[PDB]
Amino acid sequence: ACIPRGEICTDDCECCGCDNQCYCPPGSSLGIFKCSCAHANKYFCNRKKEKCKKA
């Protein structure tokens, strides 16, 4: 079970496939959250291939 879009995530590989990505945008205390699952294919992909390449 992966982390759905809009839900907070701690790890990067914790988020769903390339479809979603664990981004950590600014304004964590002033905004709504710190990191959550966001639509990022090319990102999560280019990232995973570099990090979660084995899994």
Swiss-Prot record:
It is found in: Secreted. Expressed by the venom gland. The keyword Hydrolase does not apply. The chain holds residues 36 to 90 of 90 of the full protein. Its main location: secreted. Negative results: does not target TRPV1 and TRPV4 channels. GO terms for molecular function: calcium channel regulator activity; toxin activity. The presence of a 'disulfide through disulfide knot' structurally defines this protein as a knottin. One of its GO terms (cellular component) is extracellular region. Potent blocker of nociceptor cation channels TRPA1 and high voltage-activated calcium channels. It acts mainly on P/Q-type (Cav2.1/CACNA1A) calcium channels and has a minor effect on L- (Cav1/CACNA1) and N-type (Cav2.2/CACNA1B) calcium channels. Blocks glutamate release in synaptic transmission mediated by calcium channels. The toxin also inhibits the KCl-induced increase of intrasynaptosomal free calcium. It also shows antiproliferative effects on different glioma cell lines (M059J, U-138MG and U-251MG). In vivo, it shows analgesic effects in rodent models of pain. The keyword Transferase does not apply. This is Omega-ctenitoxin-Pn4a. It comes from the Eukaryota. Keywords: Calcium channel impairing toxin, Disulfide bond, Ion channel impairing toxin, Knottin, Neurotoxin, Secreted, Signal, Toxin, Voltage-gated calcium channel impairing toxin. Belongs to the neurotoxin 09 (Tx3-6) family. Disulfide bonds join 2-16, 9-22, 15-37, 24-35, 45-52.
